[PDB]
Structure 1
Amino acid sequence: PQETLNGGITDMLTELANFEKNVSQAIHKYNAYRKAASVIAKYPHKIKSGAEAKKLPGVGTKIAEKIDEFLATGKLRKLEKIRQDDTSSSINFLTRVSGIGPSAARKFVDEGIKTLEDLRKNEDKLNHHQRIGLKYFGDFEKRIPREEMLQMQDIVLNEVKKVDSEYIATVCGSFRRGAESSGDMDVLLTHPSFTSESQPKLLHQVVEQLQKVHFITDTLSKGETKFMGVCQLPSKNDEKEYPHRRIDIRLIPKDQYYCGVLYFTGSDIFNKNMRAHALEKGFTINEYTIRPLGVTGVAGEPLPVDSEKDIFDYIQWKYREPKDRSE
């Protein structure tokens, strides 16, 4: 399916999806619209009617009508009106700043703050996270070429081992699935001296080293188990400098690492197929563990997992490369 097929409809739905989350604060309607956008995007036929589309899982009466209106006119009256609404479009925009959610974006537009300009005129009203998001508003909306991700992974794997060679680190996300680009970098971290049944400076020291070699530039949030911050490659001598990137590092217990690795590798749809799979075989998988039920449906103690493949074995199915994990 090419974009030109039903891309006109998906954009309509994606726009509608954003206004639900950001303006109406109806997060479940937001996911509903996105779900429809996805299933339509995979649909290898130029849709001729709302009735044709309503056949698909995720699309019902109300969306079918909108598709009819779009097909008949080329536009949607409601979306047109809300694109042009000064309050709503401003609220919707401000949320594109990382750190600004639909709630904060509400109060800003309430007291008159609508634009990035206005945000810069009033930074003492922004918190630490929001200032970073504002500062790198453009960079964050860029994607990362796999080549840069590789160079980023190069730096991360090196400085981690340099801190302590017993560390294990794995860059997951769409990147591990061989994607040609990424939106950020998700690093999963563990150590033999960290288990579910067991220092509380393991995460700090990795972050510390990456700040020393000037790879990590800012910090959105940092606790004992998860780091959310900003990073940047060394500018290639005389050349044009790199965009700042979003990077997440989280520390996972050794006996939950590969379950964490499996989970955050994805994809989303792959993961649902594999956890619904799965119940049929009599196991429950979350991001942390895999547990056995249980004739009445009562889970037992989480089975030991020492590799990704280990999990596949439990549920009787031949190991899959991250490459082939899109569904």
Structure 2
Amino acid sequence: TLNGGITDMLTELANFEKNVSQAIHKYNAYRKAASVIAKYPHKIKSGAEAKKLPGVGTKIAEKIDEFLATGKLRKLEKIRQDDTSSSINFLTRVSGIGPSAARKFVDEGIKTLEDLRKNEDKLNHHQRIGLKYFGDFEKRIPREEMLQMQDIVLNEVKKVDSEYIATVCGSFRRGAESSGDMDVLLTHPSFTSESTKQPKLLHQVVEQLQKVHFITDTLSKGETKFMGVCQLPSKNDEKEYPHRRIDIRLIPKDQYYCGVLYFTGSDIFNKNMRAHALEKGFTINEYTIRPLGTGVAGEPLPVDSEKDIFDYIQWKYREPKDRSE
């Protein structure tokens, strides 16, 4: 938290561009700069000191100057005062409400937590569950609880078929002491890039996790991506655990290493890596790394480890715990 004052500022600005301005590249620009200043291992004394880092330019320089003097950012102070944009940025904290839906509701006078509860009929399914567990989802999960959840999901995946492999990823695999939510990579030998020797593969796992009341709600579901809700079992008289966001990704087993790369993140690490891949003439997604021959994807290169992906784009390997950009 060396320059916590500054990354916070830039994150709030990032949210405002993402949510009220619907300016996604400004949101990325602001987030990259917050990321690179967070990695910086000195207390920043100057806006010019910051401009030296990639992703800090003039406009962020001047804002860091204003903030270091006054402790504030006038732009942020007035953004806070504005009743409209403050409401739109609140509504996007509900899972399923993004920047268009948040602005559509505040056009209809729906702008506070009491108003969403009154008009749940105007909300789709993902937004209803988002509203139901709004408080729970704001809470972070302790690594202790993440370890309990891991044991339930892996023991249940083993009871459906012992050939499943389930790998917990996200900030957990990077060694976070606390997690936003849980992310499970799933392979089965019957699902590769060649064929899908068995159907319902992801369905079976979700069904069983629902049969034991671990999974409690479904935001979205398909053949390879599940997005929903889960809860640890509690003991007698114990207050129930908070409900938790769970994501499960069924990845073809021969593409495990590219998938576990994707799912370990961070999101910003993923972005710097794929962006650097393009500079080296490659493209990386969760499935493959492919050459660029006129900027059209050639054939998947062969991949036996995570490090093989790092070697193609000519990066030294970085442990999961060092990808938390």
Q: Same fold (TM over 0.5)?
A: yes
In structure 2, relative to structure 1, the CA distance for the partners of 1:192 and 1:6 (3 Å cut) is: closer
In structure 2, relative to structure 1, the CA distance for the partners of 1:41 and 1:309 (3 Å cut) is: closer
Gaps of 5+ in 1: none
In structure 2, relative to structure 1, the CA distance for the partners of 1:121 and 1:261 (3 Å cut) is: same
What is the deviation of 1:313?
7.2
Contact 1:142 1:183 in 2 (8 A): yes
What is the deviation of 1:153?
0.6
The aligned runs of 1:108-257 (5 Å cut-off) are 108-198=105-195, 199-257=198-256
Deviations 1:172-204 (A, max 9, x none): 112112221111111111211112221231111
What is the deviation of 1:75?
2.3
Between the aligned partners of 1:271 and 1:293, the Cα distance in structure 2 is 19
TM-score, scaled to structure 1:
0.88
Residue 99 of structure 1 aligns to a residue whose secondary structure is coil
Shifted more, 192-201 versus 15-24: the winner is: 192-201
Shifted more, 108-117 versus 317-326: the winner is: 317-326
What is the deviation of 1:77?
2.1
Between the aligned partners of 2:84 and 2:315, the Cα distance in structure 1 is 52
Identity level (%): 100
What is the deviation of 1:17?
1.2
In structure 2, relative to structure 1, the CA distance for the partners of 1:297 and 1:220 (3 Å cut) is: closer
Residue of structure 1 equivalent to 2:88: 91
Q: Cα RMSD between the aligned structures?
A: 2.7
Between the aligned partners of 2:4 and 2:308, the Cα distance in structure 1 is 40
What is the deviation of 1:279?
7.4
Contact 1:255 1:304 in 2 (8 A): no
Residue 199 of structure 2 aligns to a residue whose secondary structure is coil
What is the deviation of 1:72?
3.4
Shifted more, 279-288 versus 105-114: the winner is: 279-288
Deviations 1:53-107 (A, max 9, x none): 2222111111222222223333222221121111110111111011100111101
Deviations 1:111-149 (A, max 9, x none): 111111110011100111111111111111111111111
Deviations 1:251-291 (A, max 9, x none): 11122122101221234565567667777988654321134
Shifted more, 225-234 versus 281-290: the winner is: 281-290
Residue 277 of structure 1 aligns to a residue whose secondary structure is helix
Contact 2:171 2:324 in 1 (8 A): no
Between the aligned partners of 1:24 and 1:281, the Cα distance in structure 2 is 33
Deviations 1:287-307 (A, max 9, x none): 21134566x887653244455
In structure 2, relative to structure 1, the CA distance for the partners of 1:219 and 1:49 (3 Å cut) is: same
What is the deviation of 1:51?
2.4
Deviations 1:189-220 (A, max 9, x none): 12111122212311111100000011000000
Between the aligned partners of 2:315 and 2:80, the Cα distance in structure 1 is 49
What is the deviation of 1:40?
2.1
User: Is 1:321 aligned to residue 319 of structure 2?
Assistant: yes
What is the deviation of 1:32?
1.1
What is the deviation of 1:312?
6.0
In structure 2, relative to structure 1, the CA distance for the partners of 1:105 and 1:282 (3 Å cut) is: closer
Contact 2:171 2:266 in 1 (8 A): yes
Between the aligned partners of 1:305 and 1:311, the Cα distance in structure 2 is 7
Contact 1:229 1:246 in 2 (8 A): yes
What is the deviation of 1:244?
0.4
- The alignment of Structure 1 onto Structure 2 pairs a total of residues equal to 323
Between the aligned partners of 2:136 and 2:98, the Cα distance in structure 1 is 18
Contact 1:284 1:290 in 2 (8 A): yes
Residue 276 of structure 1 aligns to a residue whose secondary structure is helix
Shifted more, 197-206 versus 227-236: the winner is: 197-206
Look at both structures and tell me which one has the larger radius of gyration over its CA atoms. Answer: 1
Gaps of 5+ in 2: none
Between the aligned partners of 2:208 and 2:66, the Cα distance in structure 1 is 56
Between the aligned partners of 2:317 and 2:232, the Cα distance in structure 1 is 34
Shifted more, 152-161 versus 68-77: the winner is: 68-77
Between the aligned partners of 1:72 and 1:124, the Cα distance in structure 2 is 48
Deviations 1:214-241 (A, max 9, x none): 1000000001111000000001232121
Shifted more, 60-69 versus 90-99: the winner is: 60-69
TM-score, scaled to structure 2:
0.89
